[PDB]
Amino acid sequence: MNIFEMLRCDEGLRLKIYKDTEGYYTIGIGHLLTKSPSLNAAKSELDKAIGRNTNGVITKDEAEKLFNQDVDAAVRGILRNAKLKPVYDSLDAVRRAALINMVFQMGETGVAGFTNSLRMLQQKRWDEAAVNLAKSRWYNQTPNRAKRVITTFRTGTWDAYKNL
Ligand SMILES: *SC1=NC(C)(C)N(O)C1(C)C
Ligand SMILES: [Cl-]
Ligand SMILES: [Cl-]
Ligand SMILES: [Cl-]
Ligand SMILES: [Cl-]
Ligand SMILES: [K+]
Numbered sequence: 746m747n748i749f750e751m752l753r754c755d756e757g758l759r760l761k762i763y764k765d766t767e768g769y770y771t772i773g774i775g776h777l778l779t780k781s782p783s784l785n786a787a788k789s790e791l792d793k794a795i796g797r798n799t800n801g802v803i804t805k806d807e808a809e810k811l812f813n814q815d816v817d818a819a820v821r822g823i824l825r826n827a828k829l830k831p832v833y834d835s836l837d838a839v840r841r842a843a844l845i846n847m848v849f850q851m852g853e854t855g856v857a858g859f860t861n862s863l864r865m866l867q868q869k870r871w872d873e874a875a876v877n878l879a880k881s882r883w884y885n886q887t888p889n890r891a892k893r894v895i896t897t898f899r900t901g902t903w904d905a906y907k908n909l
Contacts, residue, residue, distance in 0.1 A: 748816060748842040749812070751842055751897075752775065752849055753812075755890050755894075756774045756849075757775070758773065758805070759771075759773070760772070760804065760808060762784070762801045765777065766886065772803060773803060773807070773808030773812060774815075775815070775849065775850075784801075794811060819845050819853075822853035823844065823853065826857050829844070829848070832863045835866075835867050837901055839897060839901050840897065840898055842897065843894050843895075844856070846894050846897075847883075850890075851883060861877055862874055862878045862881075866898065872899060874899070875895045875896075878891070879891065
């Protein structure tokens, strides 16, 4: 397991534009295209992202290219955020992946607002952090995925992913 395999588990792979768990147009491995309800707007974002006139359909290689960029962007967002970087730097590599996963799903600003959970993670109070992380819209709307991410923070293991 690693962050790529982890997010690939959590996000799936679909080569045609689809709506994500929030109803937003998405493609590939959880590549968010737009929050606009306009499919035409989403297709325009897709063509811009890929660099060609797509029919709303991409290849697996193209999906993986966007995925690598999105994982990189999530790490970059963590490292340039004054709230997320200290927590990231304090974590082991398995729990770092859990934080990248959250930023991939909800964005840097959203995760940076989890002030009390972040403090408990920085303090390495793992069970308390896990309890606090579940008191969230995130957990309520995507509880199975949030449970996997939270178990990863709680244990520092891949137990929630290695037997999927
Ligand atoms: S989890 C997971 N990742 C891949 C895509 C390799 N899978 O088939 C699972 C087991 C759903
Ligand atoms: Cl089209
Ligand atoms: Cl330490
Ligand atoms: Cl709490
Ligand atoms: Cl709550
Ligand atoms: K998805």
